[PDB]
Amino acid sequence: MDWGTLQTILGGVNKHSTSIGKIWLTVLFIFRIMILVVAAKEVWGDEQADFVCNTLQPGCKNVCYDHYFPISHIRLWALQLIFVSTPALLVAMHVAWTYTSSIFFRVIFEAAFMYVFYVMYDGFSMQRLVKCNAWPCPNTVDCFVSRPTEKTVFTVFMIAVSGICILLNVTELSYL
Amino acid sequence: MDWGTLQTILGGVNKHSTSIGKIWLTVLFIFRIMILVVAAKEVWGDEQADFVCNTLQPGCKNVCYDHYFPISHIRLWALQLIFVSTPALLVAMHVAWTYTSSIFFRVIFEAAFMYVFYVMYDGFSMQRLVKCNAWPCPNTVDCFVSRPTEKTVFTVFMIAVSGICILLNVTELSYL
C-alpha cells in the first residue's frame, strides 16, 4: 500500500493559544493508520489456526471461536477509526452547522467503541485458556489462545490513544 | 483345553427325598465351566482396545479405563467360581467337621461376590458412555464402551446362576 503522497504547502502555522489539538489529532490519525497497517494482519491476522481445543469434538474449535471471539479486536478498531475518520477529511481545511458537530461526532463515536469494547472484553485482557461447553462441545472443554499477552499490549495502546484523541478533541470542543 | 475325561461308573443314583441338590450343583458347576470357557476370552477378552476416549489427552484411555474398570466382570466371576470350586472336589465322594462346612463355605463365598459386585457395578448395568474427569483427563471427557448390552446379558445370567446355586446349596444345608 501507500497512503498520502501530496503534502508540501503547509507553511502556515498556528499562532493562537489554541488549535494545538488539530496538530495532535492529525498526528494521531496518521499514527493510528501506520500503527494499524504495520501490525494489521500481523497480530490478529493469524488467529484462526491458533485456537487449539483439547477435544475430539468435530467443529468445536469453530464453535468456541465464535463463542468467545464473535469479532476480533482489530475490526472494532478498524471501524472505530473509520467512523472517527470522516471528520478528518472535513477538518482538512476550515477557515471562511456541521464543523463543530464533526468534532462532537468524533468524540461520541470513540466513546461508544470504548464502552461496547469493555462490555465484550471485560477485564481489558486476553485469557490464556478459555474453556467452552457449547452444544457440540460435549462437556466443558478447553480452548487455547496464542499470544494473549501481545494482543493485550496493543489493546492497552489503542485504548490509551482513544483517551487522548477524545481529550484534545473535546478540549478544543469546549471552547465556549 | 479339555477338562474331565473319566466319568463312567455312576450307576448308583439317589433314592431319598433329598440329595437332588448335588445333581443340580454338579450340573451348575460343569455348566458354569463351559459357559465360562466358551465365552471366556470372547466377550471381555477384547475390552482393552474398546474404551474410546473423545480427547487428545495422552493416556486418558488407560486412566479412565482403570477408573471405571479396576477389574472386569469375568475376573470376579473366575474368582467366585474358584473359591466356590474347592467344595466341589470335596463333595466328589462323601459317604462313610468339614463336610457340611464345605457347603456353608460355598454359600457364603457366592454371597460375598454378589454383594461386592453390586457395590462396584451398581445398577446391574453397562453404561453406553462413561465420562471421565481424571487428573490428566483435562476436563470431564467422554470415554466409550463396546457391547455394553452383551456384557449386561451375561452378567444377568451369572447372577441368576449364583442365586440358584445358593438356593439349593442352602436348601440341603438346611436339613436340620
Asked whether residue A7 is assigned to any structural domain, the reply reads no
User: Is position A8 within any domain?
Assistant: no
User: Is A140–B139 a contact, with Cβ atoms under 8 angstroms apart?
Assistant: yes
Dist CA A91 CA A93 (whole Å): 5
Q: Of the candidates B153, B156, B169, which has an alpha carbon nearest to the alpha carbon of residue B27? A: B169
Contacts A140 to B, Cβ<8 Å: 139-140
User: What kind of experiment solved this structure?
Assistant: cryo-EM
Q: Per the CB < 8 Å rule, is A140 touching B138?
A: no
d(CA A146, CA A165): 30
Q: Which residues of B140-174 are buried (b: 16+ CB within 10 A; e: fewer)?
A: ebbbebeeeeebbebbeebbebbeebbebbeebbe
In a domain, B9, yes or no: no
Report if residue A169 sits inside a domain: yes
B140 touches chain A (CB under 8 A): yes
What sections of A14-147 are H helices per DSSP?
Answer: 20-38, 60-68, 73-83, 86-91, 99-120
Cβ atoms of A170 and A107 closer than 8 Å: yes
> Among A138, A140, A143, A127, which residue's Cα sits nearest to residue A53?
A143
Q: Which residues contact A51 (CB under 8 A, 6 or more apart)?
A: A61, A64, A65, A69, A143, A144, A145, A146
The whole-angstrom distance between residue A7's C-alpha and the CA centroid of its chain comes to 26
Please check whether residue A104 lies inside any domain of the structure.
yes
Q: How far apart are CA A120 and CA B36, in angstroms?
A: 62
Q: Does B54 touch chain A (CB under 8 A)?
A: yes
Provide the grid cell at A33.
493508520
Examine residue B1 and state whether it is found in any structural domain, yes or no. Answer: no
How many domains does the structure of chain A reveal? 1
Give me the domain span that covers residue A159: 17-176
Q: Is residue A72 part of a domain?
A: yes
Exposed/middle/buried for residue B7 (C-beta within 10 Å: 0-12, 13-18, 19+): exposed
Does B91 map to a domain? yes
Check whether A110 is labelled as a binding-site residue. Answer: no
Helix (H) or strand (E) holding B95: none
Look at the block and give the residue holding cell 503522497. Answer: A5
Which three three-digit cell numbers place residue A21?
Answer: 489539538
| Cα of A30 vs its chain's centroid, Å | 14
